[PDB]
Curated annotation (Swiss-Prot):
Domain Peptidase S1: 1-224
EC number: 3.4.21.39
Keyword ATP-binding appears in the UniProt entry: no
Lineage: Eukaryota, Metazoa, Chordata, Craniata, Vertebrata
Matching PANTHER family: CHYMASE, KALLIKREIN-RELATED
Entry GO terms, CC: collagen-containing extracellular matrix; cytoplasmic ribonucleoprotein granule; cytosol; extracellular region; extracellular space; secretory granule
Record protein name field: Chymase
Role, per record: Major secreted protease of mast cells with suspected roles in vasoactive peptide generation, extracellular matrix degradation, and regulation of gland secretion.
GO biological process: angiotensin maturation; basement membrane disassembly; cellular response to glucose stimulus; cytokine precursor processing; extracellular matrix disassembly; midbrain development; peptide metabolic process; positive regulation of angiogenesis
């Protein structure tokens, strides 16, 4: 998160810190969010050979009793996910066991309503990602308030599509999600409307988020079948 503030510790108890293992390079990092006691929603490009989920974190370098380090049994990448266009950058992680509910760990279930969110309002995104182009990921959970933009603001992302994705972050500000934040939720009025997907390598906003409303049927399908 660039240009944000440190979150109040444990104030976003659904936040998940993902460490992504691959057979041929070191760990990579993403965010995600707990939507059922045994399911974390994140981005498909965060898939790997294996993934560890840490719930209950604030400062990820300091182990504490609120931590729940949970095994992932299976990754459910969207079946139409495209590694070239980044369309359908959404994935569900099934946890081996159900998380414990604590003050610091809880789910963020969707409301029944799945209305299309138009441009204009302010939303918030949180993550442990990089706080600048030349900076490491934040030790502490950070968050930032970002403007939902008209889709034309993301036209330069030639594979952006308004029906599938939200365009997030006024280009007049430095505020943005960035590397390490992928998979985290964008909340608008306390409801998860987006998932951090991708943006420019130089962190200039806007960035592209998966539009959750479009994927509600698929999410429901996976959750009912597993
Ligand atoms: C440039 C960018 C990214 C890319 C990225 C990650 O997600 C992490 C972990 C990782 C690394 C390598 C491979 C997979 C994951 O390191 C990265 O370099 C990325 C990689 C791949 C696809 C799509 C985006 N995420 C963003 C989020 C918001 C934003 F404004 C810009 C970006
Ligand atoms: Cl802010
Ligand atoms: Cl570009
Ligand atoms: Cl919020
Ligand atoms: Zn704590």
């Amino acid at each position: 998160i660039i240009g944000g503030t440190e979150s109040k510790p444990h104030s976003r108890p659904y936040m998940a810190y993902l460490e992504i293992v691959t057979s041929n390079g070191p760990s990579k990092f993403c965010g995600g969010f707990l939507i059922r006691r045994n399911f974390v929603l994140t981005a498909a490009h965060c898939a790997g050979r294996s993934i560890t989920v840490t719930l209950g974190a604030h400062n990820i370098t300091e182990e504490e009793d609120t931590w729940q380090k949970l095994e992932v049994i299976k990754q459910f990448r969207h079946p139409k996910y495209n590694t070239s266009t980044l369309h359908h950058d959404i994935m569900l992680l099934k946890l081996k066991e159900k998380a414990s509910l604590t003050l610091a760990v809880g789910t963020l279930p969707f409301p029944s309503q799945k209305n299309f969110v138009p441009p204009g309002r302010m939303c918030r995104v949180a993550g442990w990602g990089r706080t600048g182009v030349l900076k490491p990921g934040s030790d502490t959970l950070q968050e930032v308030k970002l403007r939902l933009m008209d889709p034309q603001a993301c036209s330069h992302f030639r594979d952006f599509d308004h029906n599938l994705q939200l365009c997030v972050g006024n280009p007049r500000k430095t505020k943005s999600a960035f590397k390490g934040d992928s998979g985290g939720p964008l909340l608008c009025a306390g409801v998860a409307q987006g998932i951090v997907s991708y943006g420019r390598s130089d962190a200039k906003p806007p960035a592209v988020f998966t539009r959750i409303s479009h994927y509600r049927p698929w999410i429901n399908q996976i959750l009912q079948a597993n």
